[PDB]
Symmetry: T
Subunit: 136 residues, 12 copies
């Protein structure tokens, strides 16, 4: 029933990844979750510690997480280790196709511990992740 959507650094700047703003994204996700009979809790922080605290709470609550970690995807072992604690599914989401850009973006610390990964499908990636979780 409850799903956590957690966005990391710079994702608050979506729109200004253009068109949709983060506020719009939250509204889309919430609308879509309601139709699926889920409740989406969508949060964004540029702070790794804040991110880690949200993940810790999903781990304690055994709630699933859809995570778009931004740059921390490629850099943060700490974030990986927090997510490795999740017992419910973890879907890694990237808006952009991370394999079509700089080589360094083709490595994720999260993918190996995620249930699955969706990249390059834009913001619909989040909606598709919600739908996976509604079937699982």
């Amino acid at each position: 029933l409850i799903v956590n959507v957690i966005n990391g650094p710079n994702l608050g700047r979506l729109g200004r990844y253009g068109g949709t703003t983060h506020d719009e994204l939250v509204a889309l996700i919430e609308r879509e979750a309601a139709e699926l009979g889920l409740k989406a809790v969508v949060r964004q922080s540029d702070s790794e510690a804040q991110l880690l605290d949200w993940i810790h709470q999903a781990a304690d609550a055994a709630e699933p997480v859809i995570l778009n970690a931004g740059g921390l995807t490629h850099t943060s072992v700490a974030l990986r280790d927090a997510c490795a604690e999740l017992s419910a599914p973890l879907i890694e989401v990237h808006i952009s196709n991370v394999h079509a850009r700089e080589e360094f973006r083709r490595h994720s610390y999260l993918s190996p511990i995620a249930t699955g990964v969706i990249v390059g499908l834009g913001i619909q990636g989040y909606l598709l992740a919600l739908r996976y979780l509604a079937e699982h």
Copy 2:
């Protein structure tokens, strides 16, 4: 309207990636495509040349492709170059989480030229790809 789902080597062995057989997968995909108002053409070959011919035809027809290339994902430049010709969207799909296994599976020749990539969501990955294409 028409979407090509193309599965590469070993994908004919799904079930015996267990539970669902390839015949079941075809039926699921077709059922789901019909609901979305699409027509899914689902094919599987262990032959790279056969794969290439299907991709060539999608390129000529400007039809979208959902491709799960199996091992060729990690090895075939030829397949990449055929897919690079597609003008409609190309969604790379892996059933398994390719980042949770051998290191060599973490590189795809296809990802950089794909619209996007879905891994580790099982066969629902294909359904989710269909839904992306129904919105695009």
Copy 3:
């Protein structure tokens, strides 16, 4: 009782790896298998898909395989994944000593999933593999 000997690309050219022709090799293997009280089914193809189909059938039949994949040894993830399905033993055979040539020949995708590997013992390698299987 039944053992599959599968030879991959270029192995049909043995003799023209000189002296023994592939037809001779088949006759040697069959003669030796009969003495061991086995039946050897020996096949060769330059087609990866044909190879994969033979491996699929050995997997379904739970028959052991002696495989000399030729160049695909060093390149084919698809072949590896088909062989990874075998429940009976898989003996990788190379006629030449692959460690005494180009560096790229020193990596095999097959070895990690094989029961064992025999290289550099010429065609007797196949006979020795048959003898292993006759004890196991």
Copy 4:
């Protein structure tokens, strides 16, 4: 007198490497070979096994080969080993400048066993290879 021109995967799509179609290329090559007093046999396949069979026949016939292997250039040890059997000259041809694109295209399994290599001169590359062979 007889020269084999062998084109690998995707080369059948030339034109749709734009302008000249493969049929046009065949006609150019044949016209040019006739002027040189050679007979050009020009073939294309997306199938590696078909390619290998053509190379095997050039090896048996001691005929020279001009080979544009497409993506297999960068991936196929099997193809290399077939070509390594050729006793007549082997000219590797690429239409595009393979050194001006992705890093992975800068490695060829064929170059070390080829007589020589022509890249980036477009389809005239094939004509220039024919002319080399007419002097050798």
Copy 5:
């Protein structure tokens, strides 16, 4: 007629590579060599210098060697250089499949200078090596 079987570090601990003890292995090898009409001299040391001395003596005597060097396989240039002096055949044997474990075990200093290599066939590997030498 005479064949040297030389086992390196830790191979004296076989059994405690379980089931068969080194004493058992010696008895198996000797029994099998007698049937083949050979005399097997089987020795084991954890000392590299002792190993080197045995190899030096096989080189002086032009006797073949079956060598399972244990960890030194992956580390000892000195051992390689002693074995490179052997004029009779050198068969490298590993009980375990060295390609199915840690990456560092996939490199052998010995393979490039060995006649051939047998891995992963258990102690039967030694018997199979003896049989090769009985045909050569």
Copy 6:
């Protein structure tokens, strides 16, 4: 009409790459250029600065260059940057097959900025380059 043929270090030693001397090469190139209706200006220096000055002048004159840079092929960023200024075609030529020798010769700083590359066709490589330029 005017084409610059520029040879770098050690190419003055051709003959003593044996048979043809550099003087012979110049005469062959000039003879062949005349037949093609071109004027070939052929120069050789062991001095990088001299080379750079010739390239600068071809850049100012918008004249094409056939360049065999010798060892500088593999080492000189300065030479690359001078050649990157050429607006007319740049054909990189190597007499020897640089892919059949030391690994370090398989990298060229020039190839990525050249129109194309001809290697391993001996001195005919230069003639073939002239012919390309006569068609372009």
Copy 7:
């Protein structure tokens, strides 16, 4: 007119990079900016999120940034992506010569997206950056 000088982790410890304190640095920068007819806004944080927020505000305001990111220079993709949004110039500044120390300090995620980089000129580096911006 307005220029942002942003210092990252540990830069608050300057002096205790010795002699000048961060307070002194701020006073130098402000004095120098006034002479140039600019207004310098100088901030320091050990918090990446705080840094990111400052960069976001410079991006919204189209103000130039002089950034000395400290260790995050070498580690933070998130910081890079925030800076990649800046439309005004971005000058990366390091007090120390990062190429004269540990190898890991020779890579910057920022340099490729910066207008330019000044290292090893001490705190005068900041003054020199201000002067660049006063001319641009």
Copy 8:
């Protein structure tokens, strides 16, 4: 007399590294420090900036630090540079054996600047570090 024990990201989750909670760990450390005649100040944060501030204060106070940085061990140059300022001893502690897990955990930015490192001894690692400092 005073020793700082600083724990980084995720270490607040110890117990839920299982059995002992962080509160228990603090009590153990304090009990043990008292017996040694030291005062242990034990702190934990998921925030790098908070960590850096604690390290800065130990540097100003010339107090020793026992640091278990969690994932930042493997990623944070900023943390390293703060710790490099410590004039009193710095003992790096890991509860788990970081060399028995993923390859990326086998590199620490901290070790080269630490006095020493204790890994894999569980929470007793902290007690053992305290005892080192009580002798130094």
Copy 9:
């Protein structure tokens, strides 16, 4: 009760790692073990085979080992494989901080199979290891 302290090559030279001699170290260790209610058996050899024999005996006796292997730490697969047999705890000890010196010293073949590792705490490292074992 019984603990084996095993020192490898060059450790007999401690003092001439200065101050304490190996004889002193033995006396310290023995004194400390007695206080802990253990018996320490402390041995040193420059011979790998001797080392291996001691490890074999600890494995047979299920006694714990504190091992400072010296240079063999970084080189000996054989030693690793002997230690991998230990069923009681194995504590790797280095006197010096191996991460503050040459890069090659930052890899240990032993760490992945050790219970834990203590480096850079001088000879107190051994005492601290004894204390760990007295609690386990």
Copy 10:
């Protein structure tokens, strides 16, 4: 008082790095040096030996050098070793941002021995270097 500005290969082509010609650059530098109360001696050569001779003379005279070595930046150990002799400051200058182009341009042999480095600030880089030296 006297400062040497030394430009390496291809820098004589500035303008035809566009807009400003090398003659203009010399005039700018001289004008700016005069204002600073310095005398700038500005030289350019495509010859490494000429460069080395200028550096040798600055070393003998203990004069500072601003060096833009062009491609030799990335290739010349000889140049580095000459510059390593300079006792006065050495400022490495690049007009372009060398970190925003080909990977090979991100390594400089000069940076580790330079006082500092300015890249990507265009020709103002030279003026800014002069100003550094006027303060030092």
Copy 11:
């Protein structure tokens, strides 16, 4: 006056590095040392521990060492660390040109701690080392 010449594994096999036997080498070295007014003590062992003991004794005696370590050159950190203790000069000698063979022979653990290195000058290398030491 006294110089130690120490030869490592396989060097006892010189002659059977052909022509001169080790006994001959000893006689040459002794003859040459006498002429130089030195006393040469020449020893050879295939045992690393024996080697280490000889080096330890040269360190205690502050005697110079000429060392040809054979394969251990490329493998033994232990040997390096013993030699690093020598206060008198250490000349590394190789009979063969180690840079003209396998890539792995181009790395020596000894060179960085040696006074100097002579390779490829055959046994005269030892005589030349003696002469260096007679001048130093």
Copy 12:
């Protein structure tokens, strides 16, 4: 009888590698060569082309060369290829121990084609090379 001693870039600066000047070195070498009954021709240039010309002349004259190429040792394929033409012996000499400094100095393009190499023995290295050549 005649031996060429060729010194490359920066070697003209010896003394200002301190103590002995290049003029002194020439006098030492000449004095020593005369005693050996040789004639030493000693030359130095900072110009690669000049170096190449000297090597070409030694190749034509079949005279031996002692070469200290300075930085070009590590960078110049052109120089290597000129030296590869020498039919008489080529001794590579370095004054400094190139293995005790920066990693990049541990690779020589010359060593693989040299007869032998002497490093780290100072200027006596040249004298020792002369003595080798006087015996060969």
